[PDB]
Amino acid sequence: SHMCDAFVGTWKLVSSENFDDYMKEVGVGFATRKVAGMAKPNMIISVNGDVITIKSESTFKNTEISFILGQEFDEVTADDRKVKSTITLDGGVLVHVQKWDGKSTTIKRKREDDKLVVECVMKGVTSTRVYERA
Ligand SMILES: O=c1cc(O)cc(CCc2cccc3ccccc23)o1
Numbered sequence: 541s542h543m544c545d546a547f548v549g550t551w552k553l554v555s556s557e558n559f560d561d562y563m564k565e566v567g568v569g570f571a572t573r574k575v576a577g578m579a580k581p582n583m584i585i586s587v588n589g590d591v592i593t594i595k596s597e598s599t600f601k602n603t604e605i606s607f608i609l610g611q612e613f614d615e616v617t618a619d620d621r622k623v624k625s626t627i628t629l630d631g632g633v634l635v636h637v638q639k640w641d642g643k644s645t646t647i648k649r650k651r652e653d654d655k656l657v658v659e660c661v662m663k664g665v666t667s668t669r670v671y672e673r674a
């Protein structure tokens with residue numbers, strides 16, 4: 541319990557850096573990159589017992605994942621990859637690893653001041669996405 545208290549809430553994207561290049565590195569095609577890159581999603585994080593839910597309400601694609609820390613699950617990403625995901629807590633950072641087609645990407649989510657900072661890494665390419673409370 542209380543494991544993710546500081547993550548819970550409704551968050552809105554306020555800034556992004558290098559997201560197009562991250563998406564390229566992931567293999568996202570041109571048209572999806574353009575439409576995905578415009579979006580300013582709402583990320584809604586909640587906890588009920590051991591189950592964490594992360595919803596994204598977006599003009600591009602709505603998604604919802606529910607999971608237990610350390611327990612692999614199936615995820616269809618907003619860009620339509622069918623991945624196997626595992627999310628753990630490492631030193632207060634949510635670490636989300638996605639595996640598909642022999643590839644891997646990691647999404648880290650951390651609280652920094654009044655922000656929720658999302659770092660997306662594919663090989664040598666990082667994108668930083670900053671969310672504030674909605
Ligand atoms: O938790 C968050 C918040 C973010 O801002 C970004 C991401 C990375 C996953 C993602 C989300 C939505 C669209 C995408 C399109 C292409 C590739 C990955 C995508 O996760």
